[PDB]
Design a protein around this nucleic acid. Sequence first.
RNA 1: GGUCACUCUGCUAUUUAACUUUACGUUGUAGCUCCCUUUCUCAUUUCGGAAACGAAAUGAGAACCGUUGCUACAAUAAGGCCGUCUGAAAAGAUGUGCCGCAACGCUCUGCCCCUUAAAGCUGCUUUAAGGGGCAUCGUUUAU
DNA 2: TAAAATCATATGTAAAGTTAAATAGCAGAGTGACC
DNA 3: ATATGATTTTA
Length: 1036
Amino acid sequence: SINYILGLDIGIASVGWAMVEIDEEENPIRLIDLGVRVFERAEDSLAMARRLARSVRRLTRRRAHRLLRTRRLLKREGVLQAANFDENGLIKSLPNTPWQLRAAALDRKLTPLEWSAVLLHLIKHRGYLSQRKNDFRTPAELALNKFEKESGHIRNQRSDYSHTFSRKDLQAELILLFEKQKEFGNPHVSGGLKEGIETLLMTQRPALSGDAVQKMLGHCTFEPAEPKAAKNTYTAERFIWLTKLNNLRILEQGSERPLTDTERATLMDEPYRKSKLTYAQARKLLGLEDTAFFKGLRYGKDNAEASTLMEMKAYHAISRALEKEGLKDKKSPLNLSPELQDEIGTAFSLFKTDEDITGRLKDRIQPEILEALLKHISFDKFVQISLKALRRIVPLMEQGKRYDEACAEIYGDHYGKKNTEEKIYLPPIPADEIRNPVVLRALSQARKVINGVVRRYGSPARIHIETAREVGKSFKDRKEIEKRQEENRKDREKAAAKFREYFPNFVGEPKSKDILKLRLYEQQHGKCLYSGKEINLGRLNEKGYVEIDAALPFSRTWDDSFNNKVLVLGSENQNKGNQTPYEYFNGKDNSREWQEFKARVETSRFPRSKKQRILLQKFDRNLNDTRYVNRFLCQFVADRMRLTGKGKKRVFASNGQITNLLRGFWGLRKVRAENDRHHALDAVVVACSTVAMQQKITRFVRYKEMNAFDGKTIDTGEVLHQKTHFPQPWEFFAQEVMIRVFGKPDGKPEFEEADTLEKLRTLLAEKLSSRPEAVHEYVTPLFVSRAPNRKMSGQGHMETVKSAKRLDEGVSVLRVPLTQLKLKDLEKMVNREREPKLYEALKARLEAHKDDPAKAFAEPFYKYDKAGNRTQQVKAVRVEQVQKTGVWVRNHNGIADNATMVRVDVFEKGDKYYLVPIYSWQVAKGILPDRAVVQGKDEEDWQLIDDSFNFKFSLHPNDLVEVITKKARMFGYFASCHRGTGNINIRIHDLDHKIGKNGILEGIGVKTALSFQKYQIDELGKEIRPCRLKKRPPVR
RNA sequence: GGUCACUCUGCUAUUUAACUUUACGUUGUAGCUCCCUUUCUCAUUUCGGAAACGAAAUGAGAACCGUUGCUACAAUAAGGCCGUCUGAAAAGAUGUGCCGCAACGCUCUGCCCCUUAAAGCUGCUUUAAGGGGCAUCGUUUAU
DNA sequence: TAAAATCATATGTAAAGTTAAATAGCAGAGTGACC
DNA sequence: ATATGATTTTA
Ligand SMILES: [Mg+2]
């Protein structure tokens, strides 16, 4: 066959792959083949969006269900008498004054209709119930009075948020309303009715029930049939304390030593004996004259030995719960067998509801103790090793054995249980282990590419993959990194301690967002960074008092990084909406408030990176998934695939820094020429990168002070690039590579590409004259393959609903806010002529404010009668919009634009092609469209399809298409189809931004097309084979 | 001696998946409401008149439609279902009711492509066996 | 004018929480491949 | 990014 090395540059969206032939001494000698697999889809996540849509489906459905149940309950308790309901089960003549009725129920009897309206309104708007284990008289009255005698509206609004009502405040309202209405008569104050209404209002499903944790929990390292153990387990805590104890090291004057058996015995039961065993305390218990330090620590400008080193969190948690419930003496030790401690830790870790926990503990532990435990405990996180393996390992570590010693005595080695069964073809990725569809897709596509090169060229000798790791750093660099991480650790400790201070009643310990809140409270000086008012730290858990605002919105930045979050008031955050602080304070004209906000920012303890981001006034993603893909790939490949290389480790995990340095050392520095083809180039370097070069680079950067991106060292002040030490594979490596990868010659991107075998072979036999091994069998050009998306589902329609009452005309009607009503919108306002004075006044404001609606309508706009008096305020106006097509939604009461076109069917009649667009909602419906696009006309005047039309094929996104238009011949990848125009759009495989519009041929006609035919292509860019459909495919 | 990979532990930073809720936003429908096109009915006032009667203009009042603001109800993908109790059925009662914008895969089905063999035919076709790829198929994924 | 290109404009949003999984890096203990 | 109205250019 042939001996090559396969190199891989894998990203979130692409797999650049390359092959290099090596000799019997495994050096590189020839570039055999290369390609780029682009498997992404048209651009949070798709899975995240799916999850949010599912959650809102469940929310809508559960509210509808409980309101249905409420109407039913009202019927069964005789409140309503079935002359009250209609065909739809709705209540006829249901009054629409429930706030006023909720206020009046404090002072009079209510009509059965009034009282039903009150109950349904309370249950529909039921407020937020805390989910953490732990006027007046009425929120209604209060709302009515201040808000409406003073705000004009009761409900919250987009830019004017006004109230926050607890579910318990509304529960108090409900109870007080039944008590009052029973003072006044109201034969509808049943005990059953009360129970039912209050249960419908208060009930909500648990966040975790049953096996929810177990289905997510991992499995043991050593015995994979067993689940992980919880950290809040006597066995797991004893394991962690034994590993900290056996691995503890005293750095003496010059020598270091492990703890003596006697010292280990002096410490063993210390974390059990007291709340925490700190380093300074252990120091005092150990003798340890002052010229003795601990390997680890920090030993900075703080009391480092005050840091903990161990507390038996679960031991003392259980102990303190039992103590606080008068069941264990504080002085006395905990009185439960370790098996029971493990069982109760596992219980509160796997299960969170009282029901589920008791269902696993009642027969194991005494009901007084279980009562005390449900009350004060919260547990989580689970260590990496099951309880079984830990029960086997921790006794040996009690004896002094190291971690690996015990693991090797018991299981043979401390590497754990690995499945390694070589196969020639990489086995599919388990996908049980990877709950990340983007990572899973990248891994599956890399598998497809690898098994493709194996089906085509046999087994690779060695596979080199580019990871996301960084080169072993200097000793100064990583100690600076350590200082900064340690600064953060101490900030998190201070926040957690502050939180324990203010909230002694909290059950469990602070969670991450809790440390986030208080760490912001610290860095911000205890004030809302938008309003300047101090934050009442006593109520952080009150829903709505303060909210963690993504300063730059998630919908616009997809950013959750700490530098993006500020701690602001609930009202302030919600009025901010999805604006940036710059937009929110209008800092174009430095508003009185934008000057203040900026100042508040500059006087904060924020890092100067966060400060710059909080104020950006400018726009124009994810590498975690990439590193994850790669670590997994390397591990997977090594563990499971046949390789011909000489050694035992035939997979080399590389990283971008080694590729960057080799491209800088070999000439391929490539400022900003980023086009899909480049991923092949990297792959080549990855295949040429070897372990020796890894090691040598690491030595130069760590011990010889080399910068690990530019490749330069500075002596005095010389600035020398270390190019010499890393010879490229062959002399003219750069030139050949550039030609093979990109078609054109290295020096000039200006030249037209060689786009076939003959042109490319001639070009590279010419340019590099001397090297005759450059050309050979496999020197086909680089044609970037793209995965096809032939999936039939997707977003059915856009999410704005528009009025279709005038759809025959060909217009939708949507009510636009004035602050958004720009002057081109105004002339399409519906009452442009019905209300001429209104049109003219709106025009006047827009013209006076240079057509800036936010400034034009910052002052409230009202209508005026003929007498000149002020009348109603205008905050929005219906506006007409063209609508020639759409999706009926919301019980056929509105219409929305199309969102996703699933496929385009092509037919032929008289050597003319026609296009039938099919969208997602039609699949939902089961409709297979009859009419093909006519450019100028609406869909009714489109071409009916019947027996007289020859179906050619169907077309999904990124299917390969060839269109010949006696003006030009074009080949690609289908992207879009224009219903208005009837044309298609195609991506050029390499998305070369010089041809088309950013690499997309927009507006390609296929009506007069000489030839219009669909192709396929493999993972490598090989085997381009046109295919013809036989029978037109249904949609269901 | 170094670098690396992996095992476990503490930590820092970031991300993913799953779940439970809130409040908005949009559309429709109502009630009160703002403007306002049209159309009636009446009044007043000018014109005309032999009479009755007609004509304008203004001002009240309605009504269709448009529609401003507040409140409520319904819907919140398009589309499909499930338990329990009555009931011969028709169907009624009922529920912390369940799915639907992602991904993987090849066991069943559909659908594209390649190889090998056999036979035919003057490059195609049928039978067979194997091998891929994508799915409207199986599953993660159900009351 | 019919068909093909080009330009142009619009896309749902803010929170509260219970969880599990992953990776990059710092540090501590180890084994083994590899330079 | 896609979906598609609105406009200009081309056969
Ligand atoms: Mg915000």
